[PDB]
Amino acid sequence: EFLKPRLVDIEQVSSTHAKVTLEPLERGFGHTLGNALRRILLSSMPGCAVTEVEIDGVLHEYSTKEGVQEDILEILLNLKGLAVRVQGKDEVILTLNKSGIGPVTAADITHDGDVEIVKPQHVICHLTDENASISMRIKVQRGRGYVPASTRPIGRLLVDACYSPVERIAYNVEAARVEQRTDLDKLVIEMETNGTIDPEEAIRRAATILAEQLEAFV
Amino acid sequence: SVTEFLKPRLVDIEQVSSTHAKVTLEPLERGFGHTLGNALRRILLSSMPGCAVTEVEIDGVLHEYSTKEGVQEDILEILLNLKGLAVRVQGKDEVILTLNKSGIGPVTAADITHDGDVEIVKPQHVICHLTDENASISMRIKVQRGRGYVPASTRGRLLVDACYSPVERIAYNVEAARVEQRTDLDKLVIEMETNGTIDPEEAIRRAATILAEQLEAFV
Amino acid sequence: QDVVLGLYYMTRDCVNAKGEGMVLTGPKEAERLYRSGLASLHARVKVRIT
Amino acid sequence: KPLVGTGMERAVAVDSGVTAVAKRGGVVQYVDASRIVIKVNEDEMYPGEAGIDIYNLTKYTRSNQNTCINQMPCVSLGEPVERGDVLADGPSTDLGELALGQNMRVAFMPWNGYNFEDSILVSERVVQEDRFTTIHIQELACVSRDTKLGPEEITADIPNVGEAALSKLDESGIVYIGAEVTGGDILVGKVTPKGETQLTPEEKLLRAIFGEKASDVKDSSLRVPNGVSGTVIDVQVFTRDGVEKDKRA
Amino acid sequence: EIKELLKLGDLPTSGQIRLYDGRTGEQFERPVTVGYMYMLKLNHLVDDKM
């Protein structure tokens, strides 16, 4: 009867994109599982994108702050790409306080050890003069998919939500000459995340989602 | 809150004669209709356990475009009829059945020797028409249990394309579903037609079991 | 324009494609073969048509 | 930055007065979101006056077509600049090259009829990246005039509407800057003594018997057009000579 | 020159690559033309027309 595939290798190429292996797979099941897992991963993976941002002297996102080279809109756009991991809390409020010339990066955020910033070098903005400072509050929540700010004080700036750690998924079906048996498929899934989700955890969540959806008629 | 989705239910199962059915699921999450339908279709028409006529030997035929006296159907047509001969067999993998008959008229499936544990699901399935008296059709059909569709092109004995999978046709049709407020959802609509070995619902549930078992190593 | 192109591509033949020359038991078998990837959409065959 | 251009993008961008072309070469002494200060080189410096160029970038402002005109600096601190080089790039420009749109990955094939005649099928990634998101600035003018039956007033005491609808207004009856208004919201609620007629003794007695305190003030109350949302970025009050400008003004 | 520049990269000289269907995961025969084209968002927005 059917051989059950299992996770045999997690080949971490870089910090962001990994390459997991599922083996063994019968004829045809390789493509079926690859496409199903690709759709599930690209569709529904929990993420921790920013939701709201509050700068002290800013009333709306179409203004400017003295000494900041970037418009508030560009700051919000940069934050929208911030990759962050939260473990214990569904919702957290990070703080960023910086003063003096230089690139205000994601590493200037308050540590808050329960929250991990995967790209400390991710530039947020630039400060041009010594007497210019940015003191701002960022609201990071768990979620799923894409939640535009339009669907969901006069100082609160909403940034569109991008709760999707995955960025690219590609599955290849190769030949697995193992178990003294020929024409057994091996599914190599190369997944490029933003660094906030474990590839093994991502595959596990995708399989769990597919099984839960499949339980409706079994 | 970010882990539980809209788990669908079999909202409508409208059916026609037992070899055909139409199942409907709603409301599926955005995009899940296509993936579920594609996975089910692939598993059902590519890898489903079953048994069908694998190869038939005639007493006096050694070539595909051969001729027999007194049979209206050509070798091609009788091979086609045997291809659609739905057969159910017990745990035994391969079995050989014999068909012997003389006289003017149809040669139905029931005409096959009833001895053995092989069960015929379409007894009135026409295999051939023989029009004369002195000619007698004598043949042996070998049926094996397989894992989908295996064309005879994959390599006086005649090879028949073995269609092990019970399903004759399957097609999913993802449509638009509705919820209290959400609208960008899916309404999976499976339409199945089987050869009669098992019911369409049984085929769907077997495919779901196969997929879930294949995913037990991660869940 | 798109439907006619799709139908023109569907109903067409080439001298040699996958699953050519095999005899089919009906249109349902043809669709099963095409979806399963065992025969090209445009390959000369024999089909039992009613 | 069109990947496949023709070499005329830079000329078009520079010649049209949308960028901040450096009048004289020098070194960028200061640069923020709304200003550039270039310390001119000694070679190009006139005698006497000193002599550093100041470019005040035009931030978010309305165009004739209700688009957004916004100049963003394209230079950093201490970066040398030559004469004629772009310091800030206006709308539809990247590093001084005309960029009217966005370049993205396109495939030519029919797709289930969703690109049937001339339709385009766009992925959710295009809208996720907000690359074709546009800012449109819209101007709404409420004019209080001196009509018959008295003048018009910009007071916040709007009849027939609760305090919830008037929460976003200040004490002077004008919306706050930065308030997120949607269709139907009252931006500047003006109600005028130009209301309705006066009721004769029997008529007025009957009206008061019904238990209603409708006054001689009607509701004009400029409000956002239905279906239009956004954020208020500027409020300008032009007052005629001798009118006792209000607290908001 | 376009072919030469394509070959300088690891791209096919024909300008057409092989694409797979996002829904079914099945390869599209007849390799399709994929590139990078400059879309413009013209000032005719639906919400200004409805």
PDB file of C-alpha atoms in Angstrom, chain D residues 2 99-109 111-112 132 134 136, chain E residues 17 19 21 23 28 32-41 43 45:
ATOM      1  CA  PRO D   2      11.267  52.681 -16.506  1.00  0.00           C
ATOM      2  CA  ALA D  99       8.531  57.508 -14.136  1.00  0.00           C
ATOM      3  CA  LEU D 100       4.849  57.784 -15.028  1.00  0.00           C
ATOM      4  CA  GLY D 101       4.012  54.228 -13.952  1.00  0.00           C
ATOM      5  CA  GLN D 102       5.423  50.975 -12.577  1.00  0.00           C
ATOM      6  CA  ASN D 103       7.259  48.149 -14.331  1.00  0.00           C
ATOM      7  CA  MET D 104       6.194  44.656 -13.306  1.00  0.00           C
ATOM      8  CA  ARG D 105       6.132  41.039 -14.402  1.00  0.00           C
ATOM      9  CA  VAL D 106       3.665  40.386 -17.226  1.00  0.00           C
ATOM     10  CA  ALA D 107       2.705  37.151 -18.984  1.00  0.00           C
ATOM     11  CA  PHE D 108       0.865  36.972 -22.318  1.00  0.00           C
ATOM     12  CA  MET D 109      -1.755  34.218 -22.321  1.00  0.00           C
ATOM     13  CA  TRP D 111      -6.479  33.036 -18.251  1.00  0.00           C
ATOM     14  CA  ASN D 112      -9.961  31.556 -17.765  1.00  0.00           C
ATOM     15  CA  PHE D 132      -0.211  51.519  -7.925  1.00  0.00           C
ATOM     16  CA  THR D 134      -2.308  56.901  -5.706  1.00  0.00           C
ATOM     17  CA  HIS D 136      -5.677  62.252  -4.643  1.00  0.00           C
TER      18      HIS D 136
ATOM     19  CA  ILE E  17       9.676  30.566 -20.311  1.00  0.00           C
ATOM     20  CA  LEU E  19       4.836  28.500 -16.518  1.00  0.00           C
ATOM     21  CA  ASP E  21      -0.897  26.941 -13.314  1.00  0.00           C
ATOM     22  CA  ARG E  23      -4.574  26.609  -9.289  1.00  0.00           C
ATOM     23  CA  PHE E  28       1.185  25.186 -19.358  1.00  0.00           C
ATOM     24  CA  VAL E  32       4.506  31.605 -22.604  1.00  0.00           C
ATOM     25  CA  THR E  33       6.030  35.051 -23.054  1.00  0.00           C
ATOM     26  CA  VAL E  34       6.983  36.459 -19.645  1.00  0.00           C
ATOM     27  CA  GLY E  35       8.805  39.717 -19.106  1.00  0.00           C
ATOM     28  CA  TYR E  36       8.649  43.069 -17.351  1.00  0.00           C
ATOM     29  CA  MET E  37       6.385  45.712 -18.873  1.00  0.00           C
ATOM     30  CA  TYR E  38       5.633  49.285 -17.811  1.00  0.00           C
ATOM     31  CA  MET E  39       2.019  49.580 -16.671  1.00  0.00           C
ATOM     32  CA  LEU E  40       0.490  53.030 -16.243  1.00  0.00           C
ATOM     33  CA  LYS E  41      -2.496  53.746 -13.988  1.00  0.00           C
ATOM     34  CA  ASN E  43      -6.642  58.782 -14.430  1.00  0.00           C
ATOM     35  CA  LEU E  45     -10.768  55.349 -11.759  1.00  0.00           C
TER      36      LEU E  45
END
